[PDB]
């Protein structure tokens, strides 16, 4: 090949489109692991963890991957709070699998003074919750966003998302919070950390265009889009920015090219 | 000098306001030099070549230092463009220095149909000028936005800056611009590269907080603050969020931490 060296994949719409699998996608990883090519999963679904994912992966799905290979928005919130080190009190507003994983990291549930707040998607949010992070918030605590989706895919349609319910705090505090997922930097720096290539050699793949392909323009990356998932084929051309590579099933995509 | 092993520290505002120099500035570098810790300029300031300011920071403020250590938007501006490699016509908007250097790399003036269209600070800005490239971004040029800050600091005052032409295009098109220059990342990632040393050890220095110590919380940089140049002492008590340390002059800072 001498190409693309490394592989940077979301996860819903693009390998598994909510509990119904995508034939292509599943031999696109396939193909991965054959060719012993060098790829990491990138989501800003911070509800559930590496481990439960890679799972729900070999279990619903028939794909087989280590819980390593499934970089999540949760994995960079905890290394920029690392890496910001302001004191280890915390305040979350999100599922289990980013409270869990934030305290396992090292912090201190803290719903007075914290030195961050991280607000996530939480589908038991409640009024008090909100209050504790502005009141929180007000005090000097830093305001983290997990990721800008202000949707999220689900059996009963498009619910409000992580970025909605960071907008809420925002509003509430007049604060901008520090996103960390997709598109932005934060969560691509660290993913192509793991991946091991330089982002010259590595290519985004999603299917959706304002996180997926912005990730890779707003980063400095070669972007594939899929017309498989949200954006349709339809809306290809009118996209503000053309990606990199235009497919509609990952089939269509071979690693010489 | 255990703690920070590398400084990136800001210009206007720090090393010199105006014409008038800061005495504490100049301290500030001769110690670096002294100490043989590595350092960085970067300013979002566009309307000079680093070799410009290097010339006229040696002969006008007895500040020798080789243009390599001048780190600009622009130059980070170019290596986005390049990364991004897109085509290789342009359309841009701002003073002579920012237009130049672009041209002077290996781009093409294109006002009709370039590949890229860099929106800057210009103070001749002109309504002809934003259609340019209100069209230009309407046929899939990628809009690039120099710099967010919305003001600048000037004889007369307070007057719009990069931020509010961006702004002033993006309303026009509609279509939100890749910002290149503090606090974003672009920059930032750029500016550690020319550093050398690793993030951890470094530590960003600056006069303004939404320029300088926002570039250093939103990208996980110690912070240091000089209440000389536009944010006074006054207003660190009601700060969103503290910089790492502050300080009301470079000399109050001393290297062992």
Redesign the interface.
């Known amino acids: 090949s001498l190409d693309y060296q490394g592989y940077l994949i979301d996860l819903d719409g693009t390998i598994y489109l909510g509990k119904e699998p995508i034939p292509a996608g599943k031999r696109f990883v396939e193909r991965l692991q054959e060719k012993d090519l060098p790829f990491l999963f990138v989501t800003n679904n911070t509800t559930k963890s590496p481990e439960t994912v890679a799972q729900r992966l070999a279990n619903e799905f028939d794909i087989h991957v280590p819980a390593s290979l499934v970089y999540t928005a949760t994995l960079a919130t905890i290394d ?1 709070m690392k ?2 080190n ?1 004191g280890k009190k915390v305040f979350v507003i999100g599922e289990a699998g980013l409270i869990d994983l934030i305290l396992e990291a090292g912090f201190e549930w803290d719903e007075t003074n914290p030195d961050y707040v991280v607000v996530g998607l939480d589908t038991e949010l409640s009024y008090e919750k909100v209050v504790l992070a502005t009141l929180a918030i007000q005090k ?3 305001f983290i966003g997990t990721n800008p989706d202000k949707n999220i895919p689900t059996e009963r349609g498009l619910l409000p998302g992580a970025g909605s319910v960071v907008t809420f705090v925002e509003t509430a505090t007049q ?1 901008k919070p ?1 996103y960390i997922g997709k598109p ?3 969560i691509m ?1 660290r993913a192509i950390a793991h991946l091991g290539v330089e ?2 050699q590595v290519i985004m793949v999603g299917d959706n265009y304002e996180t997926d392909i912005q990730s890779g ?4 990356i ?1 972007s594939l889009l899929v017309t498989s998932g949200f954006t349709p084929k339809s809306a290809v051309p009118t996209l ?3 990606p990199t590579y235009v497919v509609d099933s990952l089939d269509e995509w071979t690693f010489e090219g």
């Open positions: 920029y890496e910001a302001r000097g605590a830093l604060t520090v932005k930097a934060i720096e982002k010259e323009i707003q980063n400095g070669d503000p920015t053309p």
